[PDB]
Amino acid sequence: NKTKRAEQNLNNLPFLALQAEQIEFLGSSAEFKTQIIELIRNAKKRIYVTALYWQKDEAGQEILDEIYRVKQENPHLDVKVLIDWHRAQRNLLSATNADWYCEQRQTYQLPDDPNMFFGVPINTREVFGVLHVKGFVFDDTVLYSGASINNVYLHQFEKYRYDRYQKITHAELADSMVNFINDYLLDFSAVYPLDVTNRPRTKEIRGNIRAYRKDLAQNGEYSLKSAVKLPNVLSVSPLFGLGASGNELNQVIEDLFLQVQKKLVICTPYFNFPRTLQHKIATLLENGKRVEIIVGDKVANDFYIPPEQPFKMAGALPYLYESNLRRFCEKFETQIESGQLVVRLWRDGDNTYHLKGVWVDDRYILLTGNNLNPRAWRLDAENGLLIYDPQQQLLAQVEKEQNQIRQHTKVLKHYTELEELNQYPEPVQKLLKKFARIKADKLVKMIL
Amino acid sequence: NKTKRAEQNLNNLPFLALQAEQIEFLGSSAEFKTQIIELIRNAKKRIYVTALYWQKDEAGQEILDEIYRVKQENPHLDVKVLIDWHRAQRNLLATNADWYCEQRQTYQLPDDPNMFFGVPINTREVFGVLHVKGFVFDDTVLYSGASINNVYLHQFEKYRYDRYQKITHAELADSMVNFINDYLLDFSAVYPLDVTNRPRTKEIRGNIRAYRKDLAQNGEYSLKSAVKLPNVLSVSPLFGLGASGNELNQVIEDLFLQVQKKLVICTPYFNFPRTLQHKIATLLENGKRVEIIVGDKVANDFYIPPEQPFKMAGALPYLYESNLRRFCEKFETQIESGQLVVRLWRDGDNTYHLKGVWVDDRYILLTGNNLNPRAWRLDAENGLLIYDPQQQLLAQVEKEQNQIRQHTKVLKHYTELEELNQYPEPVQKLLKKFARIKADKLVKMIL
């Protein structure tokens, strides 16, 4: 029984005890920016950051300035920033992020002058996998979020890109995350500093990348010192996954979906679930459980191009996702109608939506950078903090964050409330038709 | 050092002695069809087939009819046809699996055997397919890159050009059947295609992953009477699946590195993995001769004449041409001196599907390996490496190569291939967009 196998797997997870006071769910990207800054200024021992990227724009610069300032005050501060290797060395769609890290290092010229920026390659080509592991550790504090460092994620000006942010003050969790980074992520046969002029070329290190991915996929795991099974207290379990086989994070998500007793809530940026998760939703709906899915409106996707502007191919992506959502809402029309399935669309002017999350009944809360898409199931390196809350110690804080999240949403009442293809811009129509005919749209879903 | 290790590695391969009279190079696709029929009709013990696919069409039906006849007449005949699991269950561009099931019911054999089995090399076809080749009829191996459909078998006017070698040697035959039994046919992951009630791949996902990992890591051919460094015409069966520890791909890499005088390559699409690009660059920079033989755009089956309505898949042949164009401009001086020879194959609307590596007059690799990024990381491939240290097969090799060269022209200069702005407008638009967002790079890696 897959369902009974799932209960067993969840019960077997190790968990570290967490006081409710040790966790805060931040409200907004502006708060997130403020917390980053406050945490950097107060750091005395270490600062570890794993993010998809850290951009050379004004927010990137303000944050990096804070780092150099504390580092110049504290020469023994252990600072390590891991970002995706490929993403750091290209432009979007003149200077790359890597060029900028070097520029900054040369320009500040700290007396110490250590390497601080490291590029992690999760595969030999960006398309076949990137670093999606999340977490910032400042001394004994974890700041966990799907957000990277650029203007929109930190609300530098008027626009923002919405994510979730959790601050956990817990020495043993912090030590576990830094240990993973040092022990598993930072393998110097494949990982190179990006803040030096002499960086190897990819072609130059293909074999090393391969061996590194294979090793990390099979062995990377977090370790806990004082973990128990089935604690009777609010608790946290750190999870890692890379690749399709023996992926603990994905096994946990699949099992979370199978073990819903009453209600499942899901946040995802794009409506693009792996088939395995789509099937598990269908079972839940067939068996009377409630399901709430929160995604961005078309216009809250960052590939969206206002139809007055000149159209580019990538601008069809939000429409591809919407029409897949429309098909889903049609399939589950009875459930939409009875309120068994709640589909919410987020929209706030031109701001974009990048929230990920899974909530199971009142019992589990998964904080993850996982986009819940086929890329995440096969290609990318992911992590998660699984919070177990058996006595509902966190229920009030979870609901407060969820109500903030729902503020800029509307409940879709009928699949016909979503635009049909004929209402789409003419070049999008052409494109979607072209792709659908030769099932290239299936390829897009699996790899983007 | 890589060159050094390459020689060592090749010398370490186990070889089985062959006699020159035990190998036939077939001259054409009609002849392949004729030989398939004859070999089926004469089989008394076993018929084993591994192929990408076996199409429901006149040619597919005719070969299938032959199988059913010999089986009806010889009830103990061991018959196993293994094709790709995903490919059998979709259409070009209801399915082949439904037609195998229908044929089984219709022919109504008394012991009602399963004959057609589906091999899942990955949970999604995009991520790995069965490119393992070889037909075994009793003690005769028929090795070709061809699948079973109308064009591969020249059923009507159109053909799809491949290579075909017939080897009669019971030990080779045994080695290949044993591999099929021992590694390919794991019934935890492999399912008969010709039943009414096939599992959805959703239900067997975990099995496929375990099967893929096991095969990648353990699959290999065994021989009984093999020696290293024989003084006779001999053969070595090779398998590979995956990026790491791939023996077939290591042998291909090593062959390139160990060229002394000349290298000849056939590939059905000009799309080398980076490792082979670098090695070809190295041979050229070191005075070795290289001859590469590819299809014209027109000999690509996604080609749509500029007169007919364009469909986006029609841009693929142009992507392969510009790839070749860029290569011929890079090695412009080598083309000029004659050290690099690029041939383009074209025969009306017949299509081109040749694969091959020939090193000097010493090594002849027979393989369904397309020599692309897919074959380097995704697909399950095999090959037969012939070693001919005394040039016992050279006459037959040269005859086959002469035939292969018949519908080719030698490229005089890279500008002989159209530039982007001379492509048809719809083609141009597409390629321009794809290049901007690097979609062309993606296509090279997965197609």
PDB file of C-alpha atoms in Angstrom, chain A residues 93 123-125 127-128 206 210 213-214 244-245 251 254 275-276 279 283 313 377-379 434-435 437-439 443 446-447, chain B residues 93 122-124 126-127 202 205 209 213 243-244 274-275 278 311-313 377-378 430 433-434 436-437 439 442 445-447:
ATOM      1  CA  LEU A  93      17.241  36.377 -21.756  1.00  0.00           C
ATOM      2  CA  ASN A 123      25.052  19.830 -14.106  1.00  0.00           C
ATOM      3  CA  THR A 124      27.289  20.428 -17.114  1.00  0.00           C
ATOM      4  CA  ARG A 125      24.627  22.660 -18.713  1.00  0.00           C
ATOM      5  CA  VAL A 127      19.189  23.501 -18.579  1.00  0.00           C
ATOM      6  CA  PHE A 128      19.867  20.096 -17.003  1.00  0.00           C
ATOM      7  CA  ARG A 206      32.791  18.839 -17.473  1.00  0.00           C
ATOM      8  CA  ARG A 210      29.523  14.996 -13.662  1.00  0.00           C
ATOM      9  CA  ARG A 213      26.508  15.740  -9.376  1.00  0.00           C
ATOM     10  CA  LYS A 214      26.529  11.971  -9.119  1.00  0.00           C
ATOM     11  CA  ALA A 244      14.994  11.251  -9.797  1.00  0.00           C
ATOM     12  CA  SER A 245      16.125   8.194  -7.732  1.00  0.00           C
ATOM     13  CA  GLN A 251       9.719  11.203  -1.546  1.00  0.00           C
ATOM     14  CA  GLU A 254       4.819  12.659  -2.466  1.00  0.00           C
ATOM     15  CA  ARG A 275       2.449  14.035 -13.227  1.00  0.00           C
ATOM     16  CA  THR A 276       2.985  12.138  -9.970  1.00  0.00           C
ATOM     17  CA  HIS A 279      -2.333  12.055  -9.840  1.00  0.00           C
ATOM     18  CA  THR A 283      -6.998  10.952  -5.571  1.00  0.00           C
ATOM     19  CA  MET A 313       8.676  33.891 -27.381  1.00  0.00           C
ATOM     20  CA  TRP A 377      11.721  16.247  -9.807  1.00  0.00           C
ATOM     21  CA  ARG A 378      14.642  15.366 -12.004  1.00  0.00           C
ATOM     22  CA  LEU A 379      17.087  18.120 -12.775  1.00  0.00           C
ATOM     23  CA  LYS A 434       2.331  25.386 -33.099  1.00  0.00           C
ATOM     24  CA  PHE A 435       3.733  23.821 -29.925  1.00  0.00           C
ATOM     25  CA  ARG A 437       0.436  20.213 -32.528  1.00  0.00           C
ATOM     26  CA  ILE A 438       3.812  18.458 -32.151  1.00  0.00           C
ATOM     27  CA  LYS A 439       3.594  18.191 -28.360  1.00  0.00           C
ATOM     28  CA  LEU A 443       8.833  19.365 -23.568  1.00  0.00           C
ATOM     29  CA  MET A 446       9.288  18.939 -18.394  1.00  0.00           C
ATOM     30  CA  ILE A 447      12.328  21.161 -18.822  1.00  0.00           C
TER      31      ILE A 447
ATOM     32  CA  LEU B  93       5.421  13.557 -34.910  1.00  0.00           C
ATOM     33  CA  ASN B 122      13.691   6.025 -18.721  1.00  0.00           C
ATOM     34  CA  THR B 123      10.358   7.182 -17.230  1.00  0.00           C
ATOM     35  CA  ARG B 124      10.020   9.717 -20.100  1.00  0.00           C
ATOM     36  CA  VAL B 126      12.721  12.485 -23.807  1.00  0.00           C
ATOM     37  CA  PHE B 127      15.126  11.115 -21.163  1.00  0.00           C
ATOM     38  CA  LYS B 202       2.819   5.979 -13.722  1.00  0.00           C
ATOM     39  CA  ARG B 205       7.979   4.524 -12.372  1.00  0.00           C
ATOM     40  CA  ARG B 209      14.327   3.944 -12.362  1.00  0.00           C
ATOM     41  CA  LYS B 213      20.323   2.302 -12.834  1.00  0.00           C
ATOM     42  CA  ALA B 243      27.190   9.525 -18.862  1.00  0.00           C
ATOM     43  CA  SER B 244      29.391   7.685 -16.344  1.00  0.00           C
ATOM     44  CA  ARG B 274      31.496  18.186 -27.171  1.00  0.00           C
ATOM     45  CA  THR B 275      33.948  15.420 -26.277  1.00  0.00           C
ATOM     46  CA  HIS B 278      37.381  18.392 -29.186  1.00  0.00           C
ATOM     47  CA  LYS B 311       5.710  23.428 -40.155  1.00  0.00           C
ATOM     48  CA  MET B 312       8.162  24.252 -37.352  1.00  0.00           C
ATOM     49  CA  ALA B 313       9.751  20.767 -37.232  1.00  0.00           C
ATOM     50  CA  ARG B 377      23.928  10.744 -21.599  1.00  0.00           C
ATOM     51  CA  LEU B 378      20.367   9.562 -22.216  1.00  0.00           C
ATOM     52  CA  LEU B 430      12.147  30.508 -36.318  1.00  0.00           C
ATOM     53  CA  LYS B 433      14.052  33.424 -32.263  1.00  0.00           C
ATOM     54  CA  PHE B 434      15.491  30.136 -31.118  1.00  0.00           C
ATOM     55  CA  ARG B 436      18.141  34.514 -29.140  1.00  0.00           C
ATOM     56  CA  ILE B 437      16.821  32.367 -26.263  1.00  0.00           C
ATOM     57  CA  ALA B 439      16.480  27.060 -27.845  1.00  0.00           C
ATOM     58  CA  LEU B 442      18.483  22.821 -26.229  1.00  0.00           C
ATOM     59  CA  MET B 445      21.117  18.272 -26.559  1.00  0.00           C
ATOM     60  CA  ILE B 446      17.801  16.349 -26.533  1.00  0.00           C
ATOM     61  CA  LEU B 447      16.956  15.558 -30.149  1.00  0.00           C
TER      62      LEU B 447
END
